[PDB]
Each structure stands twice: as C-alpha cells, then as structure tokens.
Subunit: 242 residues, 2 copies
C-alpha cells in the first residue's frame, strides 16, 4: 500500500563478485538511504541521496556504489572490492532534512565461495494426537523444516488458502542439526493450534510453507544434484474426523 | 486480528453428498448467521443462532442443518437433500438484537458429479519484451493459468518473497477456454508491471502463484491420473539484464 521494496530477505555473494541490491519506493520521497548493520554499532549509513542524481558517501561507503537516475529507485551495488563477511543491509526513504525515515524490510547478504553446502529444506507436517483433541479440545499441527543450508528460510501457515498468524508459534531462529560439526545443516519447527472441531472437518485444509532463499538462475551450478535455487517447499494436511 | 474463519473460498459437492462448512469466530459474539447468495434477492438468511445450543430456521433452511455446541463455532451442513446448483455461502456473527454483523470471507459451493473433469491448472510466466522495456521503461510479466476445472483458483504475485498488489492487474474471473463446449476447462491471466531497472537486476525474483481449491485427501479418486487435490501451482522468473 505504498512502501519500500528492496532485494530479497537473503542473498548470496561469492568472493570477488559484484551484486546489486534494489530499492524502490512509491512515496515520492526525495531522500533515500542505505544502511549496513554492524554488530558493533548497529545501523550505519553507507550512502545517502537528497534528490535525483545526488549521493553523499557515508563513513563505510568503501566498496559500495549507488546511482539515483530516478526518484523512485536507489540501487546499492556491493562491488567485489567489498571485503565484508556478511551483513544486513537496510534501505530507507524520507522527505529531507531531519524528517521521518521509512524502512525497507532489510536484506542479509551472505558471503561464501562454496555452494556445495547449500541445500533447500525438506518439510513435513504432523497431525495432532487423538489424546490432545479429547483432553484440551484443541488441535496442534507441527511443522518440521529440515536439512537446509544456510539458514535462509521463512515459515508460514495457510489455513483454507489464507495465511494465518494467531495460533502460530514458530522458533525464533533455525538451529544447527549438529552444533558440534561446522558444515551442519539447519532445522526449524513451528506449531499451529486450532480448535478440535475445526480440525475434525475433512474439508479444512492446512499447509506449512517454507520459503527458501537459495541460488539464483544465473548462479552456476557445478554439482550433480538439482541446484538449490530459491523455492517454496510445502507440507499439507486435511482435517481428520475422528 | 480477531475475526471470522470459515470454509475455503471454493468447495466441491457431488450430487447427493453431505458437506459441512466451518465457521468460527474469536470475537465472543453470541449470535451467528449463515446466508446464501441467490442471484435473485442477494443475501438470504439460512440459519441463525442467538446463543449456545439454539438455532432458528430461516426461510430457505430447507436441506441444511446447523449445530451450536460452542459459542465460537456455528457449522453449516449442506445435506444431500439440498437441491441447490451452486451458491455463495456467507457466515456472520454479532452481539444480538439488531447490533452490527461481522462477515466471513464467504464460500462458493459448486455442485457437480463428473469429478472426471476436475483439473488443477498449469501456470506459466512470460517475460517483458525488450521493446516495452526500452520504450516505456516499464516491464510487464504475464501469467497464464490454464486448463483447470472448475474455476476454483486464486492468483497472486510474489516479488522477492513478498506478495505484491500494486502493478497487478488480474482478470476479474476465469473464462472458459471454449465457451462453446460445456465440459470446457477454464483459463485465467494476470499482468504484473515493474520498473525496467527493477526487472533488469538478475537478483530480483518473480513468481506467479495460483492456489487451486480441488479434491480433499479423503475424497476418493477413481481415475488413473494424479488426483486433482487442493494445491499450489507456480511459475517463476528472475530478472534479465539486457
């Protein structure tokens, strides 16, 4: 409804590769910004643009470039010269001076050379136990997202076609399936709780959806297995009348 | 945030089959209603419930049954006795008397027997022409949903993982691929328009998603081909730098 649109939530950058993060707004704001979140001092300005064709460097502008051909777009390019390991890039827009800034959803740019360890997740849904149903009169569906790398996923639930939020408890973050090993894949779980009668109607549909942010179409795939491109992996279940 | 949840937007009912449409609300309303939309007089009350365990018939209550075991749920059952062809069922809740009614999203119940012709759709996305790009500086992605039956679909667009609405023009309704023939499948199209520079960034992802409301897990599949169950069919494309 008129906001900021930037690059996907997760992106890949191979050592010595040029990547551009889009950023567009339909708020007719003159000023736009690009920040990088450094664990040390939080948000830090990379570049800033007051009006079309103008851009002022920030303190960490070393390795990045921007353009402002049009008022709506302020693309940030992370050049191969950029030696940063991985970071969160946030885009923002405002009127000017010291007015209110509007922020984009943010993007994590993960830097790595090997794409051998990249894997989409497998998703499964487990029905509520007959014991929970006739004790709490509630039904809990469990979703397990497993064996994916890196931790580039977003899980959501869809009941009868619409995404739901209430009754949903998802882990705050994916966890290594084996913290011990380093080249360990991640797993994530979530629970959706609905009324027992709602779960017992055979016409009710339940779907766990996991968006995986993986390799792009252009990114070259060396291995034999199907390339781990951005994709959606789902698991679904219909209501089960007792 | 606190509303009504009813059966999916589209449902199948075979001749002489009993179907139940769920309806639940977490507004703690005492009164709940079920309407049927008849092209003739618009919304008409089927059943009404003032408080737990009580339900008053409407004028068209012939062929339907309802229960009100709990305050939150008011399930409507369309019995095989119901001789209606296809209709829109809307659920609502209120405090009581003549207070304000809150409406569910609605459900179309399509009646048919040749489950032989039920078909999920095929989805394809076509890139913008290099001519449109360097003339309008805009890019238009086209999505074609084809060969599905019945017209039980919802199309949406996903840019970089987030569903978008602006720049989206979708047909108001699916059209028969051959109005002539009766057992004709449907098709639907939609266009998503983005800036040329946005489409030229190889890191930008575009996905056309079509939710098909088909057969349930329990519904028996006689044919040989994979059963046309509820599912999601997508087509995607990445940005193409000129």
């Amino acid at each position: 409804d008129g906001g900021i649109t930037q690059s996907p939530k997760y992106l890949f950058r191979k050592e010595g590769q040029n990547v551009t993060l889009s950023c567009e707004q339909n708020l007719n704001h003159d000023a736009m910004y690009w920040y990088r979140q450094d664990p040390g001092q939080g948000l830090r300005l990379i570049y800033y643009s007051q009006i079309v064709n103008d851009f002022q460097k920030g303190d960490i502008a070393e390795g990045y470039s921007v353009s402002r051909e049009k008022k709506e777009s302020f693309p940030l390019t992370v050049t191969s010269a950029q030696k940063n390991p991985t970071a969160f890039y946030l885009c923002a827009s405002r009127d000017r001076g010291t007015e209110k800034l509007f922020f984009g959803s943010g993007t994590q740019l993960s830097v790595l050379e090997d794409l051998n360890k990249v894997f989409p997740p497998e998703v499964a849904v487990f029905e509520p136990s007959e014991a929970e149903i006739s004790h709490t009169q509630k039904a809990t569906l469990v979703c397990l997202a497993t064996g994916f790398y890196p931790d580039h996923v977003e899980l959501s639930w869809w009941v009868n076609g619409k995404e739901v939020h209430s009754g949903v408890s998802t882990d705050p973050q994916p966890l290594k399936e084996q913290p011990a090993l380093n080249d360990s894949r991640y797993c994530l779980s979530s629970r959706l709780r609905v009324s027992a009668t709602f779960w017992q109607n055979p016409r009710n549909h339940f779907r766990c959806q996991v968006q995986f942010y993986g390799l792009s179409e252009n990114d070259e795939w060396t291995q034999d297995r199907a390339k781990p491109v951005t994709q959606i992996v789902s698991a679904e279940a219909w209501g089960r009348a007792d």
